[PDB]
């Protein structure tokens with residue numbers, strides 16, 4: 732069903748997260764963590780305090796797809812286990828902010844062709860696939876986008892609900 736998912740998404744905030752490669756999304760899916768540049772770290776920490784759920788919707792650059800979505804379970808923190816992010820040439824790990832813990836809601840992919848009818852008011856009503864890393868997605872567009880993903884029957888939202 733979709734009812735627990737709708738409950739988790741109720742009054743949520745949504746952010747488009749771009750990854751340079753599949754390797755970083757794979758790491759995030761395996762370890763339940765994400766990290767970003769300080770500009771987006773500040774936005775996400777503010778959002779985490781502001782709303783019952785903050786949803787990150789992931790898209791690997793040039794893949795033509797979203798790779799899933801996850802809920803922030805923490806603000807960013809430093810000093811944990813280093814994550815061997817495949818950083819681009821020239822970016823040290825020190826350029827990153829802290830690490831956010833996340834709980835995956837859907838690890839299935841969604842092609843951009845399936846979201847062509849959804850526009851994001853916070854990015855000039857451009858198709859929701861279009862946006863910089865960290866672009867906020869307005870509630871209604873973000874909710875409908877998440878509802879387009881194939882159901883992920885491997886995940887049980889019971890434990891997620893208890894964290895709200």
Ligand SMILES: COc1cc(CN(Cc2cc(=O)[nH]c(=O)[nH]2)C2CC2)cc2c1OCO2
Nearest residue numbers: 749750751755765766767768816818819864
């Ligand atoms: C494009 O190369 C980059 C790689 C990273 C490593 N990052 C993936 C990631 C990619 C991204 O685009 N945005 C993110 O927040 N994270 C892992 C820490 C999770 C961070 C970057 C970045 O440029 C903007 O900051």
